[PDB]
């Protein structure tokens, strides 16, 4: 039987049951399911009958029920003897639920209203490994200080991760187990760390003390400093027996002085986070740095002195002792000029590959200095002032910075990367890139550049392979633009509409043909509608063209023949994106002039009232056809005559009200047909009557206004007989009529 | 009886019947209707019965039927003895329809397939005043040269306007009537104008010869030059008896020489259009200019020499004879520098108020020169390179330029206007605005400006009253910004999100309180989510704040109290726009802190699941409440208790499925209720049972999924009894169920 209301799969056997507007635990969950995701529903009661039929359950996710809190009886879960992981986040629970199964290894109660951690709630959960209680009382929420019963955690002798961040604690809890590997005490209003607080935790590898005595100036949240904005006070012997520490987080602890003796017995420390402190003085002196010869990542971001814009950054000679350093983050220091000598102390560090100076309002850099480093791989300078050379917070993320790569992994994969995005290099003059390493990945996005590139600007870094020029005002008025970069493989010119949008200025895209290695070109959002002299794009190498957000409705206007072969000269093209081009119809001859090598064609989010399915005959390699978001009415009845390659056909958000006799099971090759959000009232006997067989494995139908009379029987019957063809989200495959069926699944009817 | 399918009104009595998917002329049009708009439908046949019941018809509009052309029998209109205006544009008519009523004064057949203008079609329409036949054969359309029967127009002795633009004619037609005031022959492929062509047209006030021998380089359409790109050839005596000419259009006629003798007998010429020619030489010499002392508007745009970027513009001394000149357009000449002396010849012209140098790639201007003009009002410099001081075409519009004002009328209404938008004044230094007139309207939009304004930058033009700073990268980091402009009434800071989006930099909006005359402030699209030190906006004058496209979901996050009074200090505010702020709910206390002076509140296009209607009690002046585009489910049953001011309530695009008993006719004051595109299945007896009376005059209901059973009877009955309450577009107030009603109007059912 086709499972309902959950979607299932085998991975442990997972029941996807999230976000289906369920009002209670469905009683119809499969008895082989090991993992049950019921998150984001409208469930209000959990009782001992809620999971009665499901003792193979090892993982239950009830996060965010309902969307006025979640009501859980004493020992509602007690009979699930195999339950290991119970997620109850964001449920407005007033208490730890009573009578939780002793088999629990993972319990998350993040984002609730729990101000009392009790022996009765917890001390019997002796198998706990990971306990999350964070974000229960914080900011300006109306809540109580957290009462932690003396010794509530001491019985949990296999506990490896304890998180109590974003609660009011005032003190580190006594009687923590020595099994701890990771202790999260961020934003807990603890002012003082004594010798006793951590003395027993010889297995700790991570300690997070960030946000206690925070630095509150310009904070993007409600922020309460320690009296007189004082530092956190950490006893000299506080970290004495923390010999296995790898991660230390002291962001926003208002630190002015770092005690070198803190690091004495921490030979393995790998990642040290010191953001949002007052360490300008310490960065210039930094005795503690001599204690950290294994440190790989040091984050000193946002240590700026309120109100100062000094000329230069001052880095201690002691940075030269950070022998293992791989990345240094120095965002938000704030300074005017970077000179070669200012970074002398970093230049011999053999593994320093990332230097991050984002958001420093830097006006001038002595570029030649970077090449004197051993080998930088990522020279991140985004969001400065370089100019021509002359609940709101994700509880499961990092709070103090974004976790994403600095440079797009696709670009950094080519080699050495320089990101000068979000500056003011509004004009690249003859000497701008002198004395740089062999840059492979260059980001010049959002530099207000309005120049006419002409074939010489990048001559001093001629091996750039991935060039990001997005979001400038580039004037493409010279056929030699960018031709100096003969290794260029990826070129992104997105959002340079400034001059293209003006009909009366000239526009030249002829340089595209000059590249022998160009694979991917992005011309998106350029409002391209007129070119000068040469009307066609030509490349013998190009594999992918993104032409979304242009004016193909104008270029292919029925009265104009000039752009009828605009893409034909792209002899190697396999992927073409023509979304967002306002197209009502594509002239037959223009469609036939698309590259016959295409395997993937997107024409989604236009206004197509017409598609000539017959022309698919000229595309024997076409596998994916994306026509989502149009106004199409008519499906051909003879698709198998027109293609034997097409594997995925996407037609959601159209106006199809009729599937033709023997439509699906038209093409052997068709695996995925998406017909969601169309105007289907019914699917007939004959529309699926084609046999045999179907390679069809997915058919999406949600969002159609189905008429649920006996006329739905043949499709319902079809569904039972083709359990191999997955129909997702049956909860949303809904009857629009008649009145008494309105709102029900089509699957729920006699 | 409530009219259907057309909407009616009294103005002549107009039946709005356009764009309703009508498949034929409805037989149910009211017999008092004088004007019938049936444009943009799917009508395919017009016969003699089509209007049988409607002899009061003076105006019929059939433009764009259908959306495979329009089929019109011989004399289908002949019985409409009062028909004066017949619009048949865009209908794919192969011929002038036969047997048109002799009462016609206006006939438009623009955008058809008519290549034959015949005596049989036309010569009897002796009352014609305006005849439009333009855009039948043009560009790369597959079409025939136009055959104009000898003397087909000579019988039409009251013809005042003839348009044959965008057809292939090759020759000016002989035997035109001398009644002509306006003759449009643009893009007609006429190469030669002889002495005879116009000799009889002594009433002509406008002649359009543009686009014959066009200048084709970089044209945004299919463009065919005259042999060897030669000029149009105009006989010396071609304009000899055109003594009443006011308008002359010779754009894109490939002119290199203007014959002064052409203007000899044209003492009234007012507007002369010479765009897209080759007149750089003529502009530097220009004997013809001495012949035009009454000319008010001269357009010499786009006369650039292909490939040249000269240093300076060269204006003949003879420009000083254009005594009447009011506006001079010199876009697209192309030059580097503007010096004081280059415009000497314009400086004594007493009425020259507009100078337009858009799109010249000008790098440097000697600003002091403008003040030496008699009185410029509009100094338009948009789209240059100034930097810190050191069917596609609308047939009813102008083809060669846009018709809209150069400067927004709201800004130009304050006084002298300087538009420096779309340049590169990326930093306003101490001297940038020295030696300018008293500028009231300043446009600095899209200059890539990333400076920290600080209270001195505009000191040399301190009486700016309307300042457009949109689309820059402004760093609002100083509380004194803009305070030098103490007369400022309108300030537009839209699309300056660059720094606001960065949490870790400081942000200051305190300057807002410093203005005693500030009326309108636009902070749209700034991604505002965090401010430094001061969390509130304060002004004792501000009447209108646009805060759309910001992050009030973040500012008003339930755990943060800091922005709970963000708008309260706007003591004078009557209009507040909080659209596009991602709001799920507004905290009660934040809503109550909105200015009590509001008369107009927009919270449309958010994600509101909740609205506290009770809080409307604190807004006794509130008249318009806009909550369109949300996810609201719940309408209060007691609105009259909460407001007696509200006149317009907009709730389209929500999820309302229930109107409460005695809802509408809740508030006496409510005139306009918009409930379109919600989830109403029915409207009950009791929902409208409130009596008496209703000031309700509009109720929008289209787009609801109405259940058309007998349960719709009470509303249908209600509609008959309240003919005063207009329900628009009944065609689109449609039954969703049951099956046999699906698609019908609710008004069409037993
Ligand atoms: C103070 O500084 C320390 C750094 O020393 C920070 O510690 C990190 O805290 C974050 C957030 O709380 C932790 O990140 C989360 O880790 C979860 C577990 O990851 C482990 O398991 C996976 C495989 O399951 C491994 O790949 C991984 O390396 C670990 O072994 C992840 O499951 C989380 O990801 C999930 O949620 C995020 C939500 O955004 C999604 O983006 C993910 O795609 C996925 O759904 C998340 O990555 C992190 O592990 C901690 N570091 C360490 C070393 O333990 C503190 O956060 C910082 N304090 C503050 C307040 O900022
Ligand atoms: C060569 O140069 C001449 C200028 O000398 C141009 O002539 C103009 O041509 C345009 C477009 O064809 C005409 O503009 C249209 O005029 C219609 C009639 O306007 C009269 O009536 C109204 C009141 O009814 C008065 O306000 C007005 O001043 C006139 O008395 C308008 O109805 C049109 O507007 C309608 O359509 C446009 C479509 O975009 C809408 O925007 C409007 O809101 C409205 O729906 C339109 O304004 C213009 O009148 C001609 N000028 C003269 C003086 O006659 C040629 O166009 C140019 N040739 C080419 C090819 O560019
Ligand atoms: C311009 O278009 C280019 C090319 O399409 C865009 O880059 C491409 O972005 C897509 C995602 O939009 C990347 O694909 C994704 O990559 C990840 C990682 O492998 C994968 O998990 C996803 O399933 C998906 O495949 C693709 O790699 C990337 N290609 C390149 C060459 O970088 C680019 O983002 C566009 N520019 C702008 C401003 O939108
Ligand atoms: C920033 O918001 C300002 C103020 O709301 C915007 O200006 C205003 O724009 C509206 C139209 O959006 C103008 O109202 C319209 O004016 C015409 C002419 O009277 C009228 O026909 C319309 O019915 C409507 O009233 C309004 O006058 C104008 N106000 C001012 C002071 O200029 C401005 O456009 C916004 N900026 C951006 C970039 O969106
Ligand atoms: C070039 O720099 C721009 C701006 O820093 C990067 O744009 C960011 O891209 C990421 C992922 O694509 C988005 O999450 C950010 O929102 C973007 N930021 C902005 C301000 O646009 C771009 O990714 C960088 N290019 C490369 C190749 O790494
Ligand atoms: C300031 O200059 C900008 C750019 O020229 C003007 O923006 C144009 O505004 C009109 C009507 O608002 C739109 O039709 C155009 O699309 C806009 N163009 C662009 C490129 O944004 C703006 O209107 C000018 N400001 C004033 C006060 O006149
Ligand atoms: C990481 C940034 C921290 C705070 C900050 N915000 C800004 C900002 N929005 N614009 C600036 C522009 C130039 C220099 C510094 C800042 C700045 N800064 C540093 C700063 C330096 C100096 C002053 C004025 N005394 C104010 C601010
Ligand atoms: C009204 C404009 C007409 C054609 C044009 N288009 C452009 C353009 N896209 N960028 C320019 C940038 C600087 C100078 C001139 C142009 C230019 N120009 C003028 C121009 C001048 C000079 C040259 C190169 N010989 C090419 C083009
Ligand atoms: C949970 O349900 C029980 C009904 O047995 C009730 O007594 C209790 O008040 C409920 N909790 C909430 C928050 O309503
Ligand atoms: C480096 O640290 C040592 C402690 O080992 C300290 O005494 C010295 O002054 C530091 N160097 C500088 C330049 O401050
Ligand atoms: C630098 O990195 C490599 C790992 O690729 C490691 O073998 C080497 O020991 C490192 N050198 C230092 C000083 O840490
Ligand atoms: C492009 O500019 C270069 C250098 O500025 C110039 O030599 C050349 O004439 C231009 N190229 C073309 C094809 O116009
Ligand atoms: C680019 O290619 C074209 C045509 O193949 C050639 O004429 C041109 O000189 C090339 N330009 C450069 C700068 O390599
Ligand atoms: C065509 O694309 C493939 C895949 O990128 C590449 O191997 C080949 O070199 C390209 N062909 C040409 C002629 O550039
Ligand atoms: C589809 O394309 C073929 C080839 O251009 C043409 O013969 C046929 O008429 C087209 N069909 C439609 C409906 O336009
Ligand atoms: C118009 O209708 C008549 C039917 O009387 C038919 O003869 C004629 O062919 C029709 N025109 C078109 C274009 O179909
Ligand atoms: C101005 O026009 C006259 C004709 O009246 C002509 O002879 C004279 O040369 C022109 N002036 C200039 C500077 O060319
Ligand atoms: C200038 O404009 C005014 C109209 O306001 C008019 O009275 C005056 O005669 C004009 N002067 C000339 C030389 O045309
Ligand atoms: C703003 O800048 C001005 C001039 O640059 C400076 O005097 C002042 O200190 C700044 N104002 C504030 C309020 O910080
Ligand atoms: C602006 O107003 C504030 C408060 O009313 C005042 O303190 C400040 O000095 C004013 N600034 C200027 C530049 O007028
Ligand atoms: C309030 O607004 C009105 C209308 O703009 C204006 O007349 C009045 O001057 C403003 N009040 C104050 C105190 O600025
Ligand atoms: C609506 O507002 C009033 C005043 O804040 C409050 O008493 C009431 O509880 C609110 N209603 C809802 C449904 O939140």
Q: Would you call A392 and B557 a contact, using CB atoms and an 8 Å cutoff?
A: yes
Q: Which is nearest to A47 in space by CA: A25, A69, A68?
A: A25
φ, ψ dihedrals at B234, nearest 5°: -110, 115
> What does B625-688 look like in DSSP terms, one character per residue?
EE--SS------S-GGGT-SS--EEE--SS----PPTT-SSS-TT--EEE--SS--S---GGGG
Interface residue B709 vs chain A (CB under 8 A):
yes
Can you tell me the distance from the alpha carbon of B153 to that of B124, in angstroms, rounded to the nearest whole number?
10
DSSP assigned state of B96 = P
Interface residue A141 vs chain B (CB under 8 A):
yes
Residue A35 CA to ligand 20 centre (angstroms): 62
* 3-state DSSP of A605-663: CCCCCCCCHHHHHHCCCCCEEECCCCCCCCCCCCHHHCCCCCCEEECCCCCCCCCCCCC
Can you tell me the distance from the alpha carbon of A538 to that of A601, in angstroms, rounded to the nearest whole number?
18
Tokens of B508: 């200051």
Given ligand 2 and candidates B130, B232, B397, which is best to mutate, with the most ligand atoms within 8 Å of its CB? B397
Is B699 within 8 Å of B729 (Cβ atoms)?
Answer: no
Q: Would you call B220 and A139 a contact, using CB atoms and an 8 Å cutoff?
A: no
Considering only CA atoms, give the Rg of chain B.
31
Q: Which is nearest to B676 in space by CA: B650, B711, B696, B713?
A: B650
φ, ψ dihedrals at A183, nearest 5°: -125, 120
Can you tell me the distance from the alpha carbon of B392 to that of B140, in angstroms, rounded to the nearest whole number?
13
Tokens of A582: 């306002």
> What does B448-462 look like in DSSP terms, one character per residue?
-------S-TTTTST
Can you tell me the distance from the alpha carbon of B448 to that of B380, in angstroms, rounded to the nearest whole number?
19
Q: Would you call B221 and A561 a contact, using CB atoms and an 8 Å cutoff?
A: no
Alpha carbon dihedral A581, A587, A589, A593, in 10-degree steps, equals 10
- Show the domain range for A675: 1-750
Interface residue A477 vs chain B (CB under 8 A):
no
Q: Which region holds residue A563: left if phi is over 0, alpha if psi is between -120 and 50, else beta?
A: alpha
SS3 at position A713:
helix
Placement of tokens 């990268």 in the chain: B473
* Domain count across chain A: 1
Pocket of ligand 4 (CB under 6 A): B 410, 470, 490, 492, 494, 520, 522, 524, 544, 546
Can you tell me the distance from the alpha carbon of A611 to that of A620, in angstroms, rounded to the nearest whole number?
18
Q: For A115-177, where are the alpha helices, taking DSSP H only?
A: 119-122
Q: Looking at ligand 8, which residue's alpha carbon is closest to its atom 22? A: B307
Tokens of B662: 């005695």
Tokens of A609: 């009232």
Residue of A nearest to B136 (CA): A559
Can you tell me the distance from the alpha carbon of A664 to that of A659, in angstroms, rounded to the nearest whole number?
8
Q: Would you call A140 and B739 a contact, using CB atoms and an 8 Å cutoff?
A: no
Contacts of B391 in chain A (CB under 8 A): 557-559
CATH number at residue B689: 3.80.10.10
The technique by which this structure was obtained is X-ray
Is A147 within 8 Å of A127 (Cβ atoms)?
Answer: no
Bridge partners (DSSP) listed for residue A546: A522, A577
Cβ-based neighbours of A26, under 8 Å, separated by 6 or more: A4, A5, A6, A17
Restricting to A residues 396-435, those with a Cβ less than 8 Å away from any Cβ of B are 422, 424, 426
Contacts of B64 in chain A (CB under 8 A): none
- Closest residue to B140, CB basis, from A426, A505, A561: A561
Can you tell me the distance from the alpha carbon of B616 to that of B630, in angstroms, rounded to the nearest whole number?
18
The kind and range of the H/E element at A737 are strand A735-737
φ, ψ dihedrals at B693, nearest 5°: -120, -55
> What does A237-285 look like in DSSP terms, one character per residue?
TTTTT-TT--EEE-TTS--S---GGGGTT-TT--EEE-TTS--HHHHHH
Q: Is A455 in the pocket of ligand 13 (CB under 6 A)?
A: yes
Cβ-based neighbours of B386, under 8 Å, separated by 6 or more: B362, B363, B364, B365, B420, B423, B424, B425
> What does A583-599 look like in DSSP terms, one character per residue?
-S---HHHHHTS-TT-S
- Give the closest ligand to the alpha carbon of residue B518: 21
What is the number of residues in chain B? 750
Q: Would you call A220 and B503 a contact, using CB atoms and an 8 Å cutoff?
A: yes
Tokens of B14: 């107009």
DSSP assigned state of A451 = -
Resolution in units of Å:
2.0
Residue A212: burial class (beta carbons within 10 Å; 0-12, 13-18, 19+) = buried
Q: Which is nearest to B518 in space by CA: B547, B496, B492, B539?
A: B539
The kind and range of the H/E element at A552 are helix A552-555
Distance from CA of B503 to the nearest CA of A (A): 6
Can you tell me the distance from the alpha carbon of A301 to that of B610, in angstroms, rounded to the nearest whole number?
40
Q: Is A468 in the pocket of ligand 5 (CB under 6 A)?
A: yes
DSSP assigned state of A36 = E
Residue of B nearest to A138 (CA): B559
Placement of tokens 């187990």 in the chain: A177
Can you tell me the distance from the alpha carbon of B365 to that of B425, in angstroms, rounded to the nearest whole number?
12
């Amino acid at each position: 039987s086709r499972s309902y209301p959950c979607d299932e799969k085998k991975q442990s056997v997972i029941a996807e049951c999230s976000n289906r507007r369920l009002q209670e635990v469905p009683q119809t969950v499969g008895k082989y399911v090991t993992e049950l995701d019921l998150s984001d529903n409208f469930i209000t009661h959990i009782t001992n009958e809620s999971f009665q039929g499901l003792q193979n359950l090892t993982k239950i996710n009830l996060n965010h029920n309902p969307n006025n809190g979640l009501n859980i009886t004493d020992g509602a879960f007690l009979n699930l003897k195999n339950l290991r992981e119970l997620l109850l986040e964001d449920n407005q629970l007033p208490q730890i639920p009573s009578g939780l199964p002793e088999s629990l290894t993972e319990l998350s109660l993040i984002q609730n209203n729990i101000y009392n951690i009790t022996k009765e709630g917890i001390s019997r959960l002796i198998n706990l490994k990971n306990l999350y209680l964070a974000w229960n009382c914080y900011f300006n929420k109306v809540c109580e200080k957290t009462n932690i019963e003396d010794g509530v955690f001491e019985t949990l002798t296999n506990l490896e991760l304890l998180s109590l961040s974003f609660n009011s604690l005032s003190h580190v809890p006594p009687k923590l187990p020595s099994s701890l590997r990771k202790l999260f005490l961020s934003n807990t209003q603890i002012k003082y760390i004594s010798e006793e607080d951590f003395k027993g935790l010889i297995n700790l590898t991570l300690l997070d003390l960030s946000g206690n005595c925070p630095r509150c100036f310009n904070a993007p949240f409600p922020c309460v400093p320690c009296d007189g904005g004082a530092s956190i006070n950490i006893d000299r012997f506080a970290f004495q027996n923390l010999t296995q520490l790898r991660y230390l987080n002291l962001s926003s602890t208002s630190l002015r002085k770092i005690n070198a003796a803190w690091f004495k017995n921490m030979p393995h420390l790998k990642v040290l986070d010191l953001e949002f402190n007052y360490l300008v003085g310490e960065i210039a002196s930094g005795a503690f740095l001599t204690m950290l010869p294994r440190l790989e990542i040091l984050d000193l971001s946002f240590n700026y002195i309120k109100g100062s814009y000094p000329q230069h950054i001052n880095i201690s000679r002691n940075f030269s002792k950070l022998l293992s350093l791989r990345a240094l983050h120095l965002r938000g220091y704030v300074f005017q000029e970077l000179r070669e000598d200012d970074f002398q102390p970093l230049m011999q560090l053999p593994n320093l590959s990332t230097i991050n100076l984002g958001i420093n309002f830097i006006k001038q850099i002595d570029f030649k200095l970077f090449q004197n480093f051993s080998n930088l791989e990522i020279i991140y300078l985004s969001e400065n002032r370089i100019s021509p050379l002359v609940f709101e917070f994700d509880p499961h993320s990092n709070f103090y910075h974004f976790t994403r790569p600095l440079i797009k992994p696709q670009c950094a994969a080519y080699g050495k990367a320089l990101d000068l995005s979000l500056n003011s290099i509004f004009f690249i003059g003859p000497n701008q890139f002198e004395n740089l390493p062999d840059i492979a990945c260059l980001n010049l996005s959002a530099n207000s550049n309005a120049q006419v590139l002409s074939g010489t600007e990048f001559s001093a870094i001629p091996h750039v392979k991935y060039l990001d020029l997005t979001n400038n005002r580039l004037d493409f008025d010279n056929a030699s633009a960018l031709t100096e970069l003969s290794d260029l493989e990826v070129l992104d010119l997105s959002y340079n509409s400034h001059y293209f949008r003006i009909a009366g200025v000239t526009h030249h895209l002829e340089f595209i043909q000059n590249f022998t290695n160009l694979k991917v070109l992005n011309l998106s959002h350029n409002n391209i509608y007129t070119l000068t002299d040469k009307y066609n794009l030509e490349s013998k190498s190009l594999v992918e063209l993104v032409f979304s957000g242009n004016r193909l409705d104008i270029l292919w206007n029925d009265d104009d023949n000039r752009y009828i072969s605009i893409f034909k000269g792209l002899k190697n093209l396999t992927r073409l994106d023509l979304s967002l081009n306002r197209l009502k119809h594509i002239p037959n001859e223009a469609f036939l002039n698309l590259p016959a090598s295409l395997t993937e064609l997107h024409i989604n989010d236009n206004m197509l009232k017409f598609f000539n399915w017959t022309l698919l005959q000229q595309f024997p390699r076409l596998e994916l056809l994306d026509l989502r978001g149009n106004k199409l009415l008519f499906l051909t009845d003879s698709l198998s005559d027109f293609t034997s390659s097409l594997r995925t056909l996407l037609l959601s958000h159209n106006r199809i009200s009729h599937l033709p006799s023997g439509f699906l099971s038209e093409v052997s090759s068709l695996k995925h047909l998406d017909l969601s959000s169309n105007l289907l009232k019914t699917i007939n006997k004959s529309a699926l009557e084609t046999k045999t067989t179907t390679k069809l494995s997915m058919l999406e139908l949600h969002g159609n206004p189905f008429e649920c009379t006996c006329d739905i029987g043949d499709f319902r019957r079809w569904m039972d007989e083709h359990l191999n063809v997955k129909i997702p989200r049956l909860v949303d495959v809904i009857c629009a009529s008649p009145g008494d069926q309105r709102g029900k699944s089509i699957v729920s009817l006699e």
